[PDB]
């Protein structure tokens, strides 16, 4: 549909009212069905209008004009719906031509810590609502973990690189507002073992299929068998995979045992039969002698001597019948055994090469979660699965930095300004920052509210890079400790000529050992210029940060030579190596659901802080300290769209507080 498609593109159920809507429209959701379908149509239609042209402000007047009866009947209902959508940033978010210029008179003052996507998204919304906004950024640039490398025509993202589908993605709206060159990623990914040989198609499919079966098993092991605690410690995904692999190895051995145990049972049937046949051959041999002696007594005979010949004849034919019946039984047990000897079960679960190729699929999973699998929560690592966008994954050819830079237009941003201390009281806040270039130059910003978009890595730093006065409550600090902050690094290789299959966007490299499965395990070809981009994932990420660029570029060239040949791989013209864990304004790449954490901690991170009263017995103060960022959005963590949505959320929560709902 068209109106239902707008609900979907806004991550809303088209035929039902959400929790947020129930709160802002209690009268409607608590009342009769008819009014709800009116609400739901007005909502869905307003969204459709905004989404059809997100480059210009959709005003309330414009909305009511394009609404037809009986939906344009109630003007206050249409106004309430429009206001709700605008406030929560479902319409008139991003970069749009404003119809009614912003009033010179500004209500309230907000300091936003960090000019990453979360920070920038929030700032635009607050300014748009007529608040005085100032962003404090430690770096000499905006974007934060959206970081694009640029020398001449070379363009390569060291941070966010991929739009994970446009279906329900707010970056779909942003991509129409800003000129991003969005290019589909072709999913074809050939692997290349330690030596340089492509994995044989038949084997490749087998290992990949086993990886997916192994994952599916950890889920079964988690949800059905309830294997989520072991020694009063939360079970990791890594632990669960070890345990699932061990049970697959056990079953291989158990299978061999039962097969060989039914060969011995058949051999011990044969042994018991051959013994009977060997004894019966002796009794036949003896009885033949007796018959010869008896019949060599030439006639004429008395009847006893005749009977002796006849009786022995009868007895010898009887015994010869049995031995022939037993030699039939012998023949079929030899057929049964010749069959079993050449129908054996599997020799091994996974060969050495198979375990190496499987380690690449684990490295891929360690890349996706930006952490070793031993850190991931078995139960909750994939808790955001139900909210994944539909459509092909795309890359930004002109570099992802084009997005923050666009969002930064018309905003008060202090660069080279490192926040040191955040003070929050019943009367307001002061943020204490320094010049990053000369740390003695001290700045004091007085505001009604602080929006903190400091990465989880920074919030985790001990001793603290940023002091809170008063200190954050135990419920916040415990969430910060529990939650995982991952690491993932990129090696940018700029060449003079394309020496690789230009129709293949990415190709894998299988590591020699488990320990180094993450080390330069994947290569990206997404850019116009001749650039290959190598990931360092899993345990490799942390370790490869203490090794020089020259060595890392060295190991890259080696790996590429093996696959393409020494003659085809020149020296790179330009090389960059990301070191995200050592970056003091990141302290890692993005959040993961750590063993011992859950989705609930993301909600704890998003909850604002309310200071105590100044004078005791004074009424409950308003909330002063707010939180946005990738680590604050349970349903879209570790993403740009996550950061974006988290900013829009806080802008609404702050406006509701300081301008009234």
């Amino acid at each position: 549909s068209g109106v239902e498609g707008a609900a979907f593109q806004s991550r809303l159920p088209h035929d039902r009212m959400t929790s947020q809507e129930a709160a802002c429209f209690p009268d409607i959701i608590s009342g009769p069905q008819q009014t709800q379908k009116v609400f739901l149509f007005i909502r869905n239609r307003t969204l459709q209008l905004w989404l059809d042209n997100p480059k210009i402000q959709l005003t309330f007047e414009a909305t009511l004009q394009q609404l037809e009866a009986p939906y344009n009947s109630d003007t206050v209902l249409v106004h309430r719906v429009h206001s709700y959508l605008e406030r929560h940033g479902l319409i008139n978010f991003g970069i749009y031509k404003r119809i009614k210029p912003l009033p010179t008179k500004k209500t309230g003052k907000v300091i936003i810590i960090g000019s990453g996507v979360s920070g920038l998204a929030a700032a635009r919304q607050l300014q748009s609502f007529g608040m005085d906004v100032t962003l404090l950024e430690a770096r000499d640039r905006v974007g934060g973990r959206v970081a694009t490398f640029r020398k001449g025509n070379y363009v390569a993202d060291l941070g966010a690189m991929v739009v994970t589908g446009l279906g329900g993605n707010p970056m779909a709206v942003v991509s129409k507002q800003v000129n991003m060159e969005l290019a589909k990623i072709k999913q074809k990914c050939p692997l290349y073992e330690a030596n340089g040989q492509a994995v044989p198609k038949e084997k490749d499919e087998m290992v990949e299929q086993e990886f997916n079966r192994l994952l599916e098993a950890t889920s079964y092991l988690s949800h059905q068998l309830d294997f989520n605690v072991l020694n009063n410690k939360p079970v990791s995904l890594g632990q669960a995979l070890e345990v699932v692999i061990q049970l697959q190895e056990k079953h291989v051995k158990d299978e061999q045992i039962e097969h060989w145990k039914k060969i011995v049972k058949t051999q011990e049937e044969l042994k018991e039969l051959l013994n009977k046949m060997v004894n019966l051959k002796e009794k036949i041999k003896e009885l033949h002698q007796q018959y010869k002696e008896a019949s060599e007594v030439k006639p004429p005979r008395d009847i006893t001597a005749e009977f002796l010949v006849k009786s022995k004849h009868r007895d010898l034919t009887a015994l010869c019948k049995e031995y022939d019946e037993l030699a039939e039984t012998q023949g079929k047990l030899e057929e049964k055994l010749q069959e079993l000897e050449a129908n054996p079960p599997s020799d091994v679960y996974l060969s050495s090469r198979d375990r190496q190729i499987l380690d690449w699929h684990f490295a891929n999973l360690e890349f996706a979660n930006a952490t070793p699998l031993s850190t991931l929560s078995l139960k909750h690592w994939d808790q955001d699965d139900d909210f994944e966008f539909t459509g092909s994954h795309l890359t930004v050819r002109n570099g992802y930095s084009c997005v923050p830079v666009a969002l930064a237009e018309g905003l008060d941003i202090k660069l080279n300004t490192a926040v040191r201390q955040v003070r929050y009281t019943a009367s307001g806040c002061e943020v204490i920052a320094v010049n990053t270039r000369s740390t003695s130059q001290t700045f004091i910003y007085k505001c009604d509210a602080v929006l903190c978009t400091l990465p989880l890595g920074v919030l985790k730093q001990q001793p603290p890079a940023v002091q809170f006065v008063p200190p954050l409550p135990e419920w916040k600090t415990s969430a910060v400790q529990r939650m995982g902050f991952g690491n993932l690094n990129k090696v940018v290789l700029c060449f003079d000529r394309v020496f690789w299959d230009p129709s293949v966007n990415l190709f894998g490299h299988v590591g020699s050992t488990t320990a180094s499965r993450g080390e330069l395990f994947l290569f990206w070809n997404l850019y116009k210029a001749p650039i290959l981009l190598a990931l360092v994932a899993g345990e490799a990420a942390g370790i490869m940060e203490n090794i020089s660029d020259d060595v890392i570029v060295g190991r890259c060239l080696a790996i590429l030579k093996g696959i393409f040949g020494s003659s085809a791989v020149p020296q790179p013209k330009e090389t960059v190596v990301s070191r995200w864990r050592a970056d003091p304004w990141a302290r890692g790449s993005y959040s993961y659901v750590a063993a011992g954490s859950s989705g609930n901690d993301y909600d704890l991170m998003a909850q604002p802080i309310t200071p105590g009263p100044s004078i005791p017995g004074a009424p409950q103060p308003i909330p002063r300290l707010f939180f946005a960022g990738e680590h604050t959005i349970r349903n879209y963590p570790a993403t740009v769209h996550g950061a974006l949505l988290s900013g829009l959320r806080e802008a609404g929560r702050i406006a509701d507080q300081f301008l009234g709902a």
Binding site: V162, T164, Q187, C189, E208, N212, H361, N364, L365, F367, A368, N369, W381, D382, D384, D385, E388, F389, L506, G508, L522, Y592, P637, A638, T639
Partner: peptide, 9 residues
Amino acid sequence: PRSFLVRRP
């Protein structure tokens, strides 16, 4: 998270 996985089925 899972979304970032390459070579997805």
